[PDB]
């Protein structure tokens with residue numbers, strides 16, 4: 317029932333130092349069009365990784381998963397388990413993806429062809445296996461020259 321969206325190095329990395337280690341104007345655009353008008357479900361560290369200007373993300377119901385129910389998240393709902401929201405998007409991070417993967421039938425992935433080598437402590441995308449039906453988009457080039465591609469997985 318759950319559906320997930322993320323961007324990742326082609327090496328598997330979604331986050332380093334509690335932020336994303338690249339800027340990609342096209343992926344920001346696509347993520348925004350996929351989630352706008354829908355609840356967005358995220359974990360506590362993704363919440364505080366947001367740039368202040370976009371905390372909470374505009375035009376969407378923001379839901380933060382945390383162990384502390386009295387946690388302060390101004391302008392977001394706080395919950396203590398993964399919610400069963402009918403139109404939510406699971407937007408990260410690495411812990412929340414691992415929890416959700418088993419209960420997921422859809423994955424919308426951005427891939428980034430970047431010099432990024434795994435480091436102790438990185439946040440990593442889930443491993444998608446031969447149980448998924450894959451739809452692979454062609455490689456594209458961003459203004460900066462960084463090359464990326466959109467992929468779809470369904471179950």
Ligand SMILES: NC(=O)c1ccc[n+]([C@@H]2O[C@H](COP(=O)([O-])OP(=O)(O)OC[C@H]3O[C@@H](n4cnc5c(N)ncnc54)[C@H](OP(=O)(O)O)[C@@H]3O)[C@@H](O)[C@H]2O)c1
Nearest residue numbers: 322323331334335359360361362382383408409410411412
């Ligand atoms: N590139 C992308 O597409 C993408 C997308 C999303 C995030 N990110 C990156 O991912 C990194 C952060 O991800 P992360 O894995 O470190 O953090 P996270 O998964 O977003 O949040 C982890 C926190 O969620 C809470 N939590 C986890 N499981 C819970 C449960 N079962 N019940 C209640 N609360 C629970 C805990 O916070 P408490 O300590 O409050 O309990 C836990 O420490 C950052 O670098 C961010 O930029 C990247």
Ligand SMILES: CCc1nc(N)nc(N)c1OCCCOc1ccccc1CCC(=O)O
Nearest residue numbers: 321322323343344347348370373374407426
């Ligand atoms: C944008 C990175 C990103 N890209 C994809 N494909 N999926 C995600 N779940 C994701 O993470 C969403 C959470 C991080 O959101 C941001 C991080 C930095 C700047 C702006 C935004 C989102 C801004 C907005 O949606 O209005």
